[PDB]
């Protein structure tokens with residue numbers, strides 16, 4: 002007396018709910034700097050996403066936000082590019098508006114993809130990252146070439162500035178999803194206690 | 195204006211809900227013989243379980259049922275024993291009644307832990323499994339020693355019989371959990387469509 006098709010549909014609705022919940026949790030962990038909680042939530046979101054074979058436009062945006070935050074968190078930490086270069090590719094392909102905040106995050110990631118290699122002492126890789134991404138170019142390459150890690154350009158387009166701008170974007174995702182089914186029902190149980 | 199403690203509590207309530215949902219899904223996948231769906235649900239349950247640091251008596255039983263089904267599914271197919279020997283250790287330690295069905299499943303696993311090695315042509319391992327687990331003993335060892343894989347003893351304590359008895363136990367878990375929060379709410383959304 003069990004309809005396998007309706008059971009599979011109920012599991013797909015639940016996977017959709019779990020996906021929103023885990024995106025919300027990943028967003029808060031990234032915002033709060035809770036690295037281990039972020040790693041755990043990311044592993045759970047990655048597994049839950051395998052239970053989905055067809056995704057709506059909203060669900061695709063959700064998984065790409067998750068993948069983007071994952072590469073940003075791996076920034077310092079089957080692809081022959083660095084995590085920040087992979088975050089840059091996701092960022093430019095997400096179905097989202099290219100507003101002032103989008104360009105700021107984009108430019109901050111482009112410079113930090115070079116600066117994190119210099120911070121780690123791998124200047125040959127910083128030049129390779131620069132070549133994959135890029136008069137301004139000749140000056141930026143001269144700065145990398147001279148190992149001028151703390152140049153005022155790198156102090157303006159800093160890692161802290163990249164993280165703050167990404168965190169302000171995360172706040173918009175967090176507010177948009179804070180009302181999703183699973184977190185909303187969980188908060189009511191906690192508030193009733 | 196956000197209370198981090200109440201957010202962590204809401205995430206713990208949701209992890210508890212996801213755990214029951216994934217146990218239900220793992221049970222149905224095992225029952226239906228949907229190997230790939232089982233592997234996917236197991237990976238999701240394993241990740242979700244990391245989001246829990248304190249478990250109730252009910253939650254511990256749930257994760258041990260999941261671990262038990264996982265070893266049974268890996269039966270053919272950091273521990274120096276076979277998957278069926280690991281299932282046998284979980285089975286004898288779960289907080290559950292040792293009724294007639296429990297002994298039947300236990301004895302079927304003990305013989306199948308030997309017979310799956312013989313089926314795979316590894317008779318030295320079948321003897322090693324036998325030594326770790328065990329006049330009856332001398333006769334069972336003579337059967338392994340003579341590579342008598344299809345002896346009537348092994349035909350009575352068969353793999354199909356072990357799977358059928360485990361599946362009848364899974365039906366009791368499935369009925370006990372079929373009413374849990376997440377699957378119940380998901381079925382209502384599917385029924386309203």
Ligand SMILES: c1ccc(-c2noc(C3CCC3)n2)nc1
Pocket residue numbers: 030031032033034035036039074160161164165
């Ligand atoms: C300066 C400012 C913020 C941060 C930061 N925020 O989140 C994270 C990790 C993502 C997993 C935690 N780091 N790091 C440096």
Ligand SMILES: c1ccc(-c2noc(C3CCC3)n2)nc1
Pocket residue numbers: 043044046047050064067068069071
């Ligand atoms: C190990 C390594 C990488 C990953 C990963 N990559 O992207 C994502 C997103 C969060 C869910 C989609 N996770 N997960 C586990």
Ligand SMILES: c1ccc(-c2noc(C3CCC3)n2)nc1
Pocket residue numbers: 223224225226227228229232267353354357358
């Ligand atoms: C005889 C009878 C039943 C079965 C069987 N049931 O479930 C499974 C796998 C657990 C993941 C699917 N196999 N195999 C042989």
Ligand SMILES: c1ccc(-c2noc(C3CCC3)n2)nc1
Pocket residue numbers: 236237239240243257260261262264
């Ligand atoms: C890879 C290998 C093994 C496992 C695993 N072992 O036990 C379990 C149970 C289901 C959730 C608890 N999963 N998961 C993924």
